[PDB]
Amino acid sequence: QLSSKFGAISSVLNDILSRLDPPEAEVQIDRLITGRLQSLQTYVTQQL
Amino acid sequence: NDLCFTNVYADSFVIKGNEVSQIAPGQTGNIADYNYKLPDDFTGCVIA
Numbered sequence: 583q584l585s586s587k588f589g590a591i592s593s594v595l596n597d598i599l600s601r602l603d604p605p606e607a608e609v610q611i612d613r614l615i616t617g618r619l620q621s622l623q624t625y626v627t628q629q630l
Numbered sequence: 631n632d633l634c635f636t637n638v639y640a641d642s643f644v645i646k647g648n649e650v651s652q653i654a655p656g657q658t659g660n661i662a663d664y665n666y667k668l669p670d671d672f673t674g675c676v677i678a
């Protein structure tokens with residue numbers, strides 16, 4: 583699930599950072615962070 | 631009206647017409663690169 587875009591420009595942080603302005607890049611990073619954190623939470627609950 | 635300013639500052643600029651759009655948080659361009667830089671989390675107002 584690290585390769586899923588989650589409705590973003592890309593799935594690699596480096597390209598997002600060195601492709602857009604700081605505000606839109608921050609928005610994209612926030613979306614990616616939310617998706618990955620939900621993935622971790624789901625995995626942890628299943629493990630529990 | 632309340633809780634408005636703590637360390638308020640005023641700045642005076644003189645630029646061209648097709649240049650005010652380049653003066654904003656996170657902006658890029660010659661004026662932002664070499665003349666004046668605004669912080670990304672700039673909590674203020676711009677008057678032109």
